[model samples]
Target: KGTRVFKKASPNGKLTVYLGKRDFVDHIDLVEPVDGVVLVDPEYLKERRVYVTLTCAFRYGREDLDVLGLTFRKDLFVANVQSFPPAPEDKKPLTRLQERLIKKLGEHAYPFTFEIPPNLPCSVTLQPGPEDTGKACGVDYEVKAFCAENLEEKIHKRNSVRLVIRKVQYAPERPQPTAETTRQFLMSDKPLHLEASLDKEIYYHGEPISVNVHVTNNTNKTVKKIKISVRQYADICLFNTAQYKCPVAMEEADDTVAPSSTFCKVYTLTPFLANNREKRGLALDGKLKHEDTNLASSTLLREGANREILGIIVSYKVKVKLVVSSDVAVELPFTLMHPKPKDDIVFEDFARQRLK
Candidate 1:
């Protein structure tokens, strides 16, 4: 059949648990005898949101309404409940493990997932509504359950999660030639000399690495109509090859190529002399010591390490002829030119974001 249990609580009066946010005396359950009342194995209450309500009233006759709707603060009610925090510690272990895991994973990388419970205050059950005579009403109480220490105490934030990703930096640049060799070559009054070497030997596939050429007149006569030319292996790539060619009016060669067996680039050097009186504002030598210019080309590989084309085996040479117009024992002094090497090459990883 059915089970029936009853007990008494509160000598001065009786305490009744009701439904909804406020208290109702009519819906009261068992009366208090002398011993305090206790409910055993009450039905588990579940709701989207729940809270407890408690009412205390004095009994007159069975029909009398004494302290009919009187109620205490919601805190006085006791009912079972469960709740979670906005942020949780479940992710802490995973975050710590990720650092070690990436180190082992090496160069190629990706992302991982973890979980955390939401943060919230404890919950409570509400009593039944007076209009409904269904099973919804009996007790409106909140049972105290375990609670995590407030997030402010455990962590700096109370309701937020964060993740950070980083990669390891490695790989070395191509090495440069020793300074002793560069200094000795620049000090010579020879027809041609190597100016500098790039710290990283990788050059843009189609870009030209400016190799400074230092040429001087060591003869006893004035040089006229001098033309300098550079020649390298077919594998060498020069940037902006068209810029150094003869102007449109004096063009002597086709600037384009169909195909070649070896990578190569060549530049013709022509010197422009300013009128002596017009050169008055210029330095005594009337020659710029260091002129920096970039030769741009779209043919170079923009990303990754190209092992084969790492270092450029470069050679520098010059040619000059004397004119019979000037008569003097003038010797062209030694001059220096600064040219950029591999360090001037700028590479972009175009494919990285292309898929997105």
Candidate 2:
């Protein structure tokens, strides 16, 4: 489930794109080779900031909400994880009579067609059904795709796609008994990744600080109920060692905070799943709000002067811990942190552009 753009060609009959990291790109179309203008399609050019949306076939039916919704970030593409049922093992050739019986029952069979898109970079893997239990049979498979300069070049060099097929067992529908056991096993869930960055080295005690968090869902299923929070600390003492010893030198006129004293405040910043749903605009969990404590937005230093901060750290974490039943629950807990700030400034103009 994603969006595509048609990049038109230029006067030289050439269309060049600085391909960024993208997932699940179906195809690239050359809409108009020569528009006689230097610019690309206005709509496509505007979509540069708009990332591709990833979607799945499943969704939860609700009274007000649509049953089918986007499952991942519009910009990220993920591969499917394969699953298969087991069968008998043993290399003994089946007797004429036994072979006839098997055919009648349709016990051993594999039917499915996998298509590889042209010029698309990809990774393929196989998951075999239960092993040693005689239930294991054919292979379960998944294909992961990445954007490449030339997929044909990579495929030709390899000749054939190589895959690592691992064996797995079917989790029982019902809970296993203590003395007796069930052969079934639970399916694996997708992992969620959260990337964060902050702007500016420091903020005046009351100046507004800005942070950005990007959530990427690497699994096939949609991840709901995502949350992001911001924690703050005083870093004045890290730079001015003398201020730590002498309270008079470090103390502000208001005496609100001591020179060496370190205080911390944590605010729950709104979180979002960057996916596209015309109504949602790649915001799966609705529009997130900047949680303002409403406490005096101030800087530690004097009113107009910018406070020199050692550094600002942002911790971004994501997880899927909800369990629906005894045999089924989400299985991925992948958390990431951004201790070092990436963006130098939170441009007001850029914010306006994004809003528009």
Candidate 3:
């Protein structure tokens, strides 16, 4: 019930946009509308049309170019709409946030709401490489509130308020999922059983995943180097089919590997984006309002979400490979995303429509 208010006053302090919060959770069946009040200095907003708009857009890496090397257009809009100055027959019922602010603000605080269509995406951000510039490639939403003479008119940013908001999907609380495999070197030797696992399920931002690996070197062959890395994988539906993997974080060890023996190693791997600034094709999540992009969170989809419209899909996994007599590779799938509150949902609509 107490999601802090996000506010940004205009340069002259005549106008400020007030949002209930920054991250709006998107339910499997529906998404919350971007709604907030635009506080204004009555005199300043006198005869102008104050409008609020949301643009859910996607950007591509400039490194991706057409045949000529002419960089293809970098940014594009996936969904956009105007909330204020609604259609003649349009009207909106106030939200609890809007109601509270109306009383607290006491006039001159105009409210606006923009609905996010069903077909948009859930934070599909491709973490650009260190050298990559311009705009990050991913799906993001921006809420802009400005004062103008007409809807078509443009004004300096100082005369307006803009907020970069993120649309996140709730990954219905889900995990210590594990994986294992066996490798055989030759017809005469026994098979080696290799295993890997995570301590728990559901990893949040900046939290290192606890990875454990058990290798049973039953065969006469010995294992050399142990390589365990967390890799980010993505598919662009407009974009998929030809998917790729980018290593997010990794730990390599060449300490010990004796023949016909068994070894179990425990590690807490820190898979931070700060460590992979030079890597390309990483999917990032949330808004980089601070140019602070995180290792893109995994894309979570449920029963009703459509794959065709989900422009790009991002996922994370733990990859374990044994540098050995028979180059063994074992992987365990896991999810990475932002954690949310238990019941303080931004939208009562979806909050009440909670899924099991």
Candidate 4:
């Protein structure tokens, strides 16, 4: 329900364009056909035509010029808006506000629709601070409307209006299934075994991730402490370089365990961007350095392939470190994933079989 409306008036103040539902989250009904309305004063459209378009853009850059110095952009989608030149006979009647505008300013109303492409990526905007002059990098989407004498003529800045939009994905409807693992470490004299498990493999924003750990210290050394943390990972492929891991949440246990003793404990860690507000390069759900970001969901890949194929990939993990003695500590890692909607093929096949 986060819809943004943008309004722009012509240089002569005779024509105004109002774009509705600019902010979207990749829904078929909302994006398949984007809508807009235009109001034109009398004699304003005598020799000119109105045009509108929806566009998806990809951009990458940095605020610091000396570091790497990379600027890349590509337009992935462009679609034209269709409108009834004058007015369609069977078109719906205008509302009272539209009628008053027409009567007061001698204006006419025209409606338009734009069909969005199916495979466009979500809109992401990275803003630079007032002191930072370099350009920021991210993907963005927009809708623009302009008036021109001909299709091939250049549209002047004063004759057009643009609004930013976003395509977003929500958390999965259900929690992820639980996963567990066990490992053994060969110490000086005997073997020490450790078992770790997670409440669930998938977690949503603002949710808690419970980790269950049991350590069996069969050797002579004493177990000192246990540390658990959730880390976010991002892979950036520019010249085959760059990967980062940031700890989003962490917890520790200081209790000690003697030899031939068992340590059973449960630790809870929550990964939220709010907790690490000042940290940079952290994976986020919607936007970087924005209030709407959640802890970024895990990035998924097909079997046998890698993230380098794509420009960027983001993933996450939960790690447990057991401090057994002065110089030795055992660590175990578990994967954390975010749930997304199933593909359209599954739904289409179900529908086809139901008809039979």
lDDT of each: 0.20, 0.21, 0.67, 0.57
Scored by lDDT, model 3 comes in at: 0.67
**lDDT tens string, model 1, 157-217?**
1221111111111122343532211111212253221122222233322223332222233
lDDT of 2 by residue, 1-356 (tens): 43222122222321221111111222212111110001122332332221111112111112124223521111112232111111233223434333332343243221111222222211111111123111111111222221122323332211121122111111111221111111222243534333334443322222333333333434343333322332212122111221101000011111121222222222222222221111110101111221211111111222443332211111122221212122212211111111111111111110101332
What tens-digit string does per-residue lDDT give for candidate 3 at 134-198? 33456667777777876678777888876777777665555347566766563336777788888
lDDT of 3 at 38: 77
Listed in order, each prediction's TM-score against the native is: 0.16, 0.16, 0.74, 0.68
> After superposing candidate 2, which stretches have Cα over 4 Å from the reference?
1-190, 232-356
Candidate 3 deviant stretches above 4 angstroms:
1-4, 9-15, 27-30, 40-48, 61-92, 104-106, 117-119, 130-136, 147-160, 175-178, 186-188, 236-244, 255-257, 286-293, 302-308, 341-356
Q: Which model scores highest in lDDT?
A: 3
> Please, what are the lDDT tens digits per residue for candidate 4 over residues 1-356?
33234555656565566544334544423343555566655465565677777777655665344233365656667776433254344354454433443344333666655556544445543333344423344456677767766668898766676655555534333444444445455455666767677766556666787777877777778878888888877665533346667888888878687888888888887877767656656545445534444554444454565444334466677777777674333333444433333511010110101111
How many clashes would you count in candidate 3? 8
The list of candidate 4 runs beyond 4 A from truth reads 1-23, 27-35, 38-46, 62-71, 84-109, 114-118, 125-136, 149-152, 175-186, 237-241, 285-290, 300-311, 326-356
Clashes of each: 23, 22, 8, 0
lDDT of 3 at 151: 66
